[PDB]
Structures are given as structure tokens and as C-alpha cells.
Write a protein that binds this ligand. Structure first.
Ligand SMILES: Nc1ncnc2c1ncn2[C@@H]1O[C@H](COP(=O)(O)OP(=O)(O)O)[C@@H](O)[C@H]1O
Ligand SMILES: Nc1ccn([C@@H]2O[C@H](COP(=O)(O)O)[C@@H](O)[C@H]2O)c(=O)n1
Ligand code: ALF
Ligand SMILES: [Mg+2]
Length: 194
């Protein structure tokens, strides 16, 4: 009767592991709000800030943008959507992301688990090249893609391992057809009481 603070699920995975694809299904069936940090950042550069050409340069190189930009974008959207729960997609991608979250957000959300989509690099590469045929994204090319893998491997995997220490990671294998992946996703969110 006091208002419940939002539930948050972090959705992580390599580049092109299918986070956005599966998050759209969850929005559809469960009515959570999907916040893709990458989308939000592409939005922020596309009208036409301050930070816009930094974001462009870092995205093209597969680098993680300074967390004050990204966490502000997440927090604004969350604050605009009282009484919803949130799929925070592609964040946190390093320890700075995670610390800046805890600093800003921690008393105001119940962050529940990390949903991790596990996929082979070689499969991700093929998806991302295919996507790049029509996505118009500056990072869907062989150069950027391999830079994105290194950033994932070096920075992001440590974050997932950190959450896994506290038993807060749910792993779904993502090297199958999208409906087979989603069947498991839908079953998980049902089992978690959502
Ligand atoms: N299970 C899957 N099998 C094959 N293609 C997939 C699968 N999941 C997503 N895709 C495709 O791979 C690409 C990357 O998926 P996307 O969800 O955008 O990735 P990300 O994890 O970067 O958000 C898209 O073109 C998407 O349609
Ligand atoms: N937490 C995040 C999420 C995305 N990004 C940037 O946006 C790019 C695209 O991310 P997505 O694949 O999640 O859309 C990343 O490779 C990275 O350069 C970021 O800097 N910080
Ligand atoms: F999360 Al992506 F390409 F959109 F890695
Ligand atoms: Mg995405």
C-alpha cells in the first residue's frame, strides 16, 4: 500500500547471443519493460548531445561507455515507469557499470538475478554479420565484432562470475532455435513467480 520498488533482471550474454530477441518475448508475455542499454545509448547519440560522438566512437570500437551516461539513461527510464518491472539488457558489462548501479539504484530496486544466454562465439559472429545486412548498426562488422568479443571476455565475464558467486545467475543455452530458447525463458520466469 506503500508502492513496491521494481524487480530488475539483468540480461547478459555475448554480442548477438539473443538478449534483445528474448527480451521482446518476455515483454509480450509478462509485461515487463525492456531497457536495452545499447539501444538507450544509440538513442542518446542520435539526438544530439554532449556525449553523442563519444558514444559513437566507443560503440564502433566495442568499448564500454562511462557509467554516468549509461546509468543516468537507465535511471530516467525506470523513474518514468512507476509500478513496472524491468529487463535491464546488456548491463552491467563491467565492474564500473555494476558499482555505478549499486551506488545509484540499490535502495530503489530489487535486482533479482542475472539471466545469462550462453552462446559460442562462432555462432554469435554469424548472427551479427547477418544482422548487419539490415541493422544499420556501426558495430555489426567483422572489425567491431571481434573487439566486442574481447570486451565481453575481459570485462563482462568477471561481472557474471561475481554474481554467480552469490548464486544469482540463471544460465540458458542459446545455441538453438529461438522458440526452443524462449520455451526455457518463459518456464524460468513462471518458476520465479513472474
Ligand atoms: N536463437 C537464435 N537463433 C538464430 N538467430 C537468432 C537467435 N536469437 C536471435 N537471433 C538473431 O541474432 C541476431 C542478434 O540477436 P539480438 O537479440 O539482437 O542480440 P543481442 O544479444 O546483441 O541483443 C538478430 O539478428 C536475431 O534475430
Ligand atoms: N552497458 C553497456 C551496454 C552497451 N554499451 C555499448 O553499446 C554497444 C552495443 O551494445 P548492445 O549490443 O547491447 O546494443 C556495446 O558494444 C558498447 O559499445 C555500453 O558501452 N555499455
Ligand atoms: F547486445 Al548486442 F549486439 F545488441 F550484443
Ligand atoms: Mg541487443
Amino acid at each position: 500500500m506503500e508502492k513496491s520498488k521494481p524487480n530488475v533482471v539483468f540480461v547478459l550474454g555475448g554480442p548477438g547471443s539473443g538478449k534483445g530477441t528474448q527480451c521482446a518475448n518476455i515483454v509480450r508475455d509478462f509485461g515487463w519493460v525492456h531497457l536495452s542499454a545499447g539501444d538507450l545509448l544509440r538513442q542518446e547519440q542520435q539526438s544530439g548531445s554532449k556525449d553523442g560522438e563519444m558514444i559513437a566512437t566507443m560503440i564502433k570500437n566495442g568499448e564500454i561507455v562511462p557509467s554516468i551516461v549509461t546509468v543516468k539513461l537507465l535511471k530516467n527510464a525506470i523513474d518514468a515507469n512507476q509500478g513496472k518491472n524491468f529487463l535491464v539488457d546488456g548491463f552491467p558489462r563491467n565492474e564500473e557499470n555494476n558499482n555505478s548501479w549499486e551506488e545509484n539504484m540499490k535502495d530503489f530496486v530489487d535486482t533479482k538475478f542475472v539471466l545469462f544466454f550462453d552462446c559460442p562465439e562462432e555462432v554469435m559472429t554469424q548472427r551479427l554479420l547477418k544482422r548487419g545486412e539490415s541493422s544499420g548498426r556501426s558495430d555489426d562488422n567483422i572489425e567491431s565484432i571481434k573487439k566486442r568479443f574481447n570486451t565481453f571476455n575481459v570485462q563482462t565475464k568477471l561481472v557474471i562470475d561475481h554474481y554467480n558467486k552469490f548464486d544469482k545467475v540463471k544460465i540458458i543455452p542459446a545455441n538453438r532455435d529461438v522458440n526452443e530458447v524462449y520455451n526455457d525463458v518463459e518456464n524460468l520466469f513462471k518458476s520465479m513467480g513472474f
